[PDB]
Scaffold this active site. Structure first.
Site, mmCIF file in Angstrom:
data_model
loop_
_atom_site.group_PDB
_atom_site.id
_atom_site.type_symbol
_atom_site.label_atom_id
_atom_site.label_comp_id
_atom_site.label_asym_id
_atom_site.label_seq_id
_atom_site.Cartn_x
_atom_site.Cartn_y
_atom_site.Cartn_z
ATOM 1 N N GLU A 35 0.844 -1.200 0.000
ATOM 2 C CA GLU A 35 0.000 0.000 0.000
ATOM 3 C C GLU A 35 0.880 1.251 0.000
ATOM 4 O O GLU A 35 0.573 2.191 -0.759
ATOM 5 C CB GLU A 35 -0.972 0.062 1.168
ATOM 6 C CG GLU A 35 -2.239 -0.778 1.115
ATOM 7 C CD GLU A 35 -3.201 -0.398 0.042
ATOM 8 O OE1 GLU A 35 -2.825 0.713 -0.544
ATOM 9 O OE2 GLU A 35 -4.195 -0.999 -0.297
ATOM 10 N N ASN A 46 -5.981 11.127 -6.075
ATOM 11 C CA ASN A 46 -6.932 10.358 -6.889
ATOM 12 C C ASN A 46 -7.803 11.244 -7.776
ATOM 13 O O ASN A 46 -7.888 12.455 -7.610
ATOM 14 C CB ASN A 46 -7.758 9.386 -6.058
ATOM 15 C CG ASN A 46 -7.002 8.210 -5.486
ATOM 16 O OD1 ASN A 46 -6.943 7.142 -6.116
ATOM 17 N ND2 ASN A 46 -6.425 8.384 -4.307
ATOM 18 N N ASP A 48 -11.333 11.552 -8.376
ATOM 19 C CA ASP A 48 -12.369 12.399 -7.768
ATOM 20 C C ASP A 48 -11.795 13.491 -6.866
ATOM 21 O O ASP A 48 -12.599 14.256 -6.312
ATOM 22 C CB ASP A 48 -13.492 11.628 -7.097
ATOM 23 C CG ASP A 48 -13.172 11.181 -5.686
ATOM 24 O OD1 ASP A 48 -11.982 11.241 -5.317
ATOM 25 O OD2 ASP A 48 -14.070 10.776 -4.928
ATOM 26 N N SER A 50 -9.753 12.841 -4.160
ATOM 27 C CA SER A 50 -9.343 12.257 -2.866
ATOM 28 C C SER A 50 -7.868 11.869 -2.842
ATOM 29 O O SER A 50 -7.278 11.519 -3.872
ATOM 30 C CB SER A 50 -10.235 11.088 -2.515
ATOM 31 O OG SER A 50 -10.331 10.183 -3.585
ATOM 32 N N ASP A 52 -4.916 9.541 -0.528
ATOM 33 C CA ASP A 52 -4.644 8.426 0.395
ATOM 34 C C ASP A 52 -3.481 8.668 1.345
ATOM 35 O O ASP A 52 -2.372 8.930 0.839
ATOM 36 C CB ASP A 52 -4.388 7.160 -0.428
ATOM 37 C CG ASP A 52 -5.509 6.749 -1.342
ATOM 38 O OD1 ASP A 52 -6.653 7.171 -1.098
ATOM 39 O OD2 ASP A 52 -5.242 5.993 -2.292
ATOM 40 N N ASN A 59 -7.710 6.869 2.896
ATOM 41 C CA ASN A 59 -8.421 7.832 2.059
ATOM 42 C C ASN A 59 -9.341 8.854 2.716
ATOM 43 O O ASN A 59 -10.170 8.598 3.599
ATOM 44 C CB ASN A 59 -9.078 7.026 0.947
ATOM 45 C CG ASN A 59 -9.837 7.818 -0.075
ATOM 46 O OD1 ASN A 59 -11.015 8.127 0.176
ATOM 47 N ND2 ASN A 59 -9.234 8.136 -1.213
#
EC number: 3.2.1.17
Length: 129
Positions: A35, A46, A48, A50, A52, A59
């Protein structure tokens, strides 16, 4: 923070993240690896909008508040930056909250893809657990 396999594993052990929801430690360690390559300060943006955060790449659209996500919530009631630190208790306490919701550790696409169905012990083998 670039945590070691056994270093991180020792931490995750004392914070009672063993059999947490019936998941062995190696599950956690492996998930942290795939990860965020054990970097407690990774951040992957990301589509949209967002982002992490941390060790276990948590997130911002539902678990944290960075105040930059033109979308929704904060189920973990913690500001994202709290997750970006050398002290992974914020990320590991929030993590416990994600794993409590049906999917368990399925939320970690990286776990699921490279750790559900692997010799997880493999990651704690060698440590001072």
């Amino acid at each position: 923070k670039v945590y070691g396999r056994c270093e991180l594993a020792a931490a995750m052990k004392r914070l009672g993240l063993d059999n947490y929801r019936g998941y062995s430690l190696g599950n956690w360690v492996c998930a942290a690896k795939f990860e965020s390559n054990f970097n407690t300060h990774a951040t992957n943006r990301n589509t949209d909008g967002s982002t992490d955060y941390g060790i276990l790449q948590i997130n911002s659209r539902w678990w944290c508040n960075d105040g930059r996500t033109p979308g929704s919530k904060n189920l973990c009631n913690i500001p994202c930056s709290a997750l970006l630190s050398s002290d992974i208790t914020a990320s590991v306490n929030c993590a416990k909250k994600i794993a409590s919701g049906g999917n368990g550790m399925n939320a970690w696409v990286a776990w699921r893809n490279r750790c559900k169905g692997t010799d997880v012990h493999a990651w704690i083998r060698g440590c001072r657990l």
